[model samples]
Target: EQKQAEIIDQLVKRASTCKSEALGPLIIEATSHPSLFAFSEILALPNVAQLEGTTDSVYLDLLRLFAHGTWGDYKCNATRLPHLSPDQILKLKQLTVLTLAESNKVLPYDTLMVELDVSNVRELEDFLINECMYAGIVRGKLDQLKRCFEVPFAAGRDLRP
Candidate 1:
């Protein structure tokens, strides 16, 4: 428990003080930690934004990815960012889906399959029902007949206006 707290403290401190170029690896490392779940608040800090002036594109990429990038985009650029565990990647995907659902209340399963790169209905349903809904990122009913997810609510994020 002490070790986990220390890791979280160190990551918060590093993000508070590091240069933009240095932030990518730090963010990747932090996210890779199982206990580190929510990052929106940390990323919203003024000091974290101060690093954006650096020439390094990694920080910008990280910001974009967290804010709006899709699962497909993440998969395509996985090598460029820090390695994420399956759970971390799933969380990210859930966040993105929630963002999309916020804009469009009802999303077809086919659209999600395409966006998430899932091969079949079972995989998509499992992810949406088991992972996303259970996590409280989104509240919705899956219409197997219509092949759509009817989202009534989605947890909000600090997305840029």
Candidate 2:
């Protein structure tokens, strides 16, 4: 079992009972949680899912960011989207790396650099290592010569139904 599963469950339970108006702050909390990933449970909750098309939909879009969006997607819709605080922006980068890491298990430095708005290789690779390997989700290594991240073993993100 994933080490973070229990925590996801706890957050899901909290979301279940919290008022809809509170969803935004709660989502900010969950996404910023260092170990939080696999957002399927909270995404699946009706209380969480029903925010669509409501005034609270911005927060729902924020939830979607972690589930399946890259930073590019956020850039594409930043104005209408909820405010991405400093920590949440960092977490979005982390989750973007995770989503890409899970995609083909390999990606060029420039690819992530642009996707992540990272200007240089060192910063790019450092966050990838800290977020992917050090986060306990996957063991990843970047090929300096090839400039691509490689992962033979990586955890998968849960898709909401």
Candidate 3:
């Protein structure tokens, strides 16, 4: 656990330092390796809004990153990317559910659906159905998720669902 925290801190530092495209890989890497990594400290100056230039997708991506992180699943950042294909979305949700299931936490399916942007993709019903198979529906993993997904948010809600 201690080592994981250290790794997370390192990842967060790197992410915060990123000047171009900060929100993309930073969130992905942190979430993907929550067990061995996380964002120990939340940087104050220059939040994600300031770091990556406020955009709808970027904004929602950061929110989801924090939401899933706080809610459960230490590796929520892994699924924080925007404009994902149906297959990619399924993989992300599945991975998240698996990660959360380990701690016995069930993610808010409705909340997740709301977080996603379906304009590029078609067949929301099928997309969600495919992803639903992975929802664990448990609890007690928020700490782990927070270890990586928690980051600075500027303010305002814009999920673009």
Candidate 4:
């Protein structure tokens, strides 16, 4: 039990300081930990938005990777969790990205700029669908384009896309 508390504490601390790039790997670690169960309840605990500079794109990409299997198998029997259906899978994927985007827009100014470019709403929109939205369809293939757009170039504006 002490070990579990320590692990959880470490996880929380790492999460607090992590950038968008680091958040995905952390999620994998959490899901794969021997003591944790790979289920919806546990998966929901990681507040993806709280990760220092994580953009909607990065969080969604992580979800995609989790669904399709890029994080690797540790404690779980399979690399990826089974989905309810293709449609449900698609909706969840889309919703995750959308929610991330929405949340980023409302985050503190400095953080928001770190995740999005206010001058280029078009690119942000494209980034969401192409990198995150499209990638999930093919078992979450890691796209170079999506990864590239994970960081933002501006601050203080929501720049909804």
Lowest summed lDDT across 10 adjacent residues in model 2 is found at 152-161
Cα lDDT tens digits for candidate 4, 74-157? 113233343234433333333334334344432232332233332354554564556443443211222344332242311111
Model number with the top lDDT: 2
**How many clashes in each candidate?**
0, 0, 10, 2
lDDT of each: 0.71, 0.79, 0.40, 0.40
lDDT, candidate 2, 13-130, per-residue tens: 8888878888878888888888776787787789988889888888888887777787888998989887677877887777777777777778888888887999999998788777
Report the Cα RMSD per candidate: 5.0, 2.0, 12.5, 17.0
Candidate 1: 10-residue stretch with minimal lDDT? 30-39
lDDT score at residue 93, model 3, on the 0-100 scale: 48
Tens-digit per-residue lDDT, 23-137, candidate 3: 5555555445424212324322244445544553564454445434432332344465454444434444444433443443344434334344333223333443443322322
Q: Which scores better on lDDT, 1 or 3?
A: 1
Native-referenced Cα lDDT, model 1: 0.71
Clashing pairs in 4: 113-154, 113-155
Q: Measured by TM-score, how close is model 4 to the native structure?
A: 0.29
Best by TM-score: 2
How far out, in Å, is residue 42 in model 4? 8.0
Name the runs in model 1 displaced over 4 angstroms: 1-26, 29-40, 52-60, 159-161
Candidates arranged by TM-score, highest first: 2, 1, 3, 4
Indicate the residue-level lDDT of 12 in model 4. Answer: 66
lDDT of 3 at 49: 45
